[PDB]
């Protein structure tokens, strides 16, 4: 287990997402599904010139998996996945400028639902989750677990759970008062409202 500090601006963004009063929390799901969709476009595009990129799995889909016992909602994709370098350095580096612009825009009166335009919609997970665990496997790298409860740090470790082939699982450990996002009817409503044109099958698992 390696522990890392977020760059100061990302820590500030995370605290703002956790601390600001903002009732329209449901927008987290569209942000995460959109990230999965982008990741599936990416591996789809790369495989046009190198079909061996799909040896790790041909099926391109998104699964939404609620689990009331664990209080988790998991967004699964078989997209491109993320390398260790992504997880520790590169996404954070790209995210710094997006963070600064988002924070600026939040005066001029943008609101939190606009986070996705700044490339940091991932952090919207913290509207609803007290901890987020990301299991991910990229073709060029090993399977990793990233995790953070915010507070300025995150961890990364090689994952020894079940091998996933290729892609990403974002496990949202939900806040005690956010268990509505485990209900089948609430998830269907949100997907229908915000994500009904995604070009990959989205399967809502039931309990
Ligand atoms: C361009 C942003 C892409 C990074 N990313 C994201 C969003 C993301 C964004 C992050 O920082 C902006 C980040 O660092 C903490 C991260 O770590 C797990 C994930 N989701 C996926 C996904 N499902 N599959 C592939 N790449 C993804």
Curated annotation (Swiss-Prot):
Domain-related comment: The TPR repeat-binding motif mediates interaction with TPR repeat-containing proteins like the co-chaperone STUB1.
Binding site for ATP: 35, 77, 96, 122
Region named Interaction with NR3C1: 1-207
UniProt GO BP: activation of innate immune response; cardiac muscle cell apoptotic process; cellular response to heat; cellular response to virus; chaperone-mediated autophagy; chaperone-mediated protein complex assembly; mitochondrial transport; neurofibrillary tangle assembly
Name of this chain's protein: Heat shock protein HSP 90-alpha
Modified positions (N6-acetyllysine) in chain numbering: 42, 68
Function: Molecular chaperone that promotes the maturation, structural maintenance and proper regulation of specific target proteins involved for instance in cell cycle control and signal transduction. Undergoes a functional cycle that is linked to its ATPase activity which is essential for its chaperone activity. This cycle probably induces conformational changes in the client proteins, thereby causing their activation. Interacts dynamically with various co-chaperones that modulate its substrate recognition, ATPase cycle and chaperone function.
PTM: ISGylated. S-nitrosylated; negatively regulates the ATPase activity and the activation of eNOS by HSP90AA1.
Family in the record: Belongs to the heat shock protein 90 family.
Keyword Transit peptide (UniProt): no
Subcellular localization: Nucleus; Cytoplasm; Melanosome; Cell membrane
Subunit details: Homodimer. Identified in NR3C1/GCR steroid receptor-chaperone complexes formed at least by NR3C1, HSP90AA1 and a variety of proteins containing TPR repeats such as FKBP4, FKBP5, PPID, PPP5C or STIP1. Forms a complex containing HSP90AA1, TSC1 and TSC2; TSC1 is required to recruit TCS2 to the complex. The closed form interacts (via the middle domain and TPR repeat-binding motif) with co-chaperone TSC1 (via C-terminus). Interacts with TOM34. Interacts with TERT; the interaction, together with PTGES3, is required for correct assembly and stabilization of the TERT holoenzyme complex.
GO cellular component: apical plasma membrane; axonal growth cone; basolateral plasma membrane; brush border membrane; cell surface; cytoplasm; cytosol; dendritic growth cone
Keywords associated with the record: Acetylation, ATP-binding, Cell membrane, Chaperone, Cytoplasm, Host-virus interaction, Hydrolase, Membrane, Mitochondrion, Nucleotide-binding, Nucleus, Phosphoprotein, S-nitrosylation, Stress response, Ubl conjugation
Outcome following mutation: residue 81 to D: Abolishes ATPase activity
First-to-last residue of the parent protein present: 17 to 223 of 732
GO molecular function per UniProt: ATP binding; ATP hydrolysis activity; ATP-dependent protein folding chaperone; CTP binding; dATP binding; disordered domain specific binding; DNA polymerase binding; enzyme-substrate adaptor activity
Gene that specifies this protein: HSP90AA1
